[PDB]
């Protein structure tokens, strides 16, 4: 399969990314609490549904929510302001709440069953989001030998996500509060602006009724 790209909604962020986030890849966005990582996650869940001429892949999206950050009303607002039908945008985004890190790891196996079901239909899964991927791993693995166990567990989780990305031609997008194909550092700036830098030029964008934009 040819590498597809999903537009982030910001032309500036898209140019930094080579046209958007790639399928058969894991893109990780990291930053401090309140930098806009979840906003980007929400905008991509809408953008993936658009035709390629509009920056999408005619795809559906899976959203693994670890900290209760999924807002369907936000997807609706983003869809309405991008000239999409809000009810239809919601019907193409499936959300699952991860209750702890072990549950989060099992949800990746369940995502594979949903990907298989939709494979070769008119709306195949083209995006899998894991919001605050490390949140549960950081709060649960405190102690002596807990740190080596945290590392073994995340390594296995990340390898399961890499496997899905390549096998089913999906863009995996993960957020992390301070392994990936691409790492993007996100920070707040002056005048409510958000700044993105590739880790290993800078994009500048705003958080608006259109999700994220120039
Ligand atoms: O509703 C469910 O049973 C369910 C289970 C797993 C996953 C989703 C939904 C959506 C995101 C991917 C992981």
UniProtKB/Swiss-Prot annotation:
ATP binds at residues 31-38. The keyword Magnesium does not apply. GO terms for molecular function: ATP binding; ATP hydrolysis activity; ATP-dependent DNA damage sensor activity; damaged DNA binding. GO terms for biological process: DNA recombination; DNA repair. The keyword rRNA processing does not apply. Keywords: ATP-binding, DNA damage, DNA recombination, DNA-binding, Nucleotide-binding. It comes from the Archaea. Belongs to the eukaryotic RecA-like protein family. Involved in DNA repair and in homologous recombination. Binds and assemble on single-stranded DNA to form a nucleoprotein filament. Hydrolyzes ATP in a ssDNA-dependent manner and promotes DNA strand exchange between homologous DNA molecules. This is DNA repair and recombination protein RadA. The gene is radA. The chain holds residues 108 to 349 of 349 of the full protein.
